[PDB]
Amino acid sequence: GMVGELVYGKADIAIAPLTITLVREEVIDFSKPFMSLGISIMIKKPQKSK
Amino acid sequence: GMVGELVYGKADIAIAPLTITLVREEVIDFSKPFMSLGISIMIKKPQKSK
Structure with a gap:
């Protein structure tokens, strides 16, 4: 997922x-x-009619 | 205050x-x-009354 792309370098920041x-x-x-x-x-x- | 006693080294942490x-x-x-x-x-x- 998103965190993984940060640790392995496939991205430089994540916002979500x-x-x-x-x-x-x-x-x-x-x-x-x-x-x-x-x-x-x-x-x-x-609310319905009750 | 408390923050000052951290920058000046008079305390080691501020829990408050x-x-x-x-x-x-x-x-x-x-x-x-x-x-x-x-x-x-x-x-x-x-709705104190009455």
Whole structure:
């Protein structure tokens, strides 16, 4: 994937929704967060007539 | 303040609710965020009556 192209030299930078994990930080250097997020819930409105 | 005691060698690390700003990143190495936050709103408890 994207991280791999950075480690093996097939690219010089990667910009995308890349999750800041420790397993990746060991091999590459991340920038500070430009978009903070977390797990959240998704449902209908609904609203329906009830 | 705390950032000063790192640049001047009076301390070895600063662990605190320290804002990750650009002016501070120029003089000290920040770690990744241990606690994401942002500006919010605070109001009273509504519907107290009656």
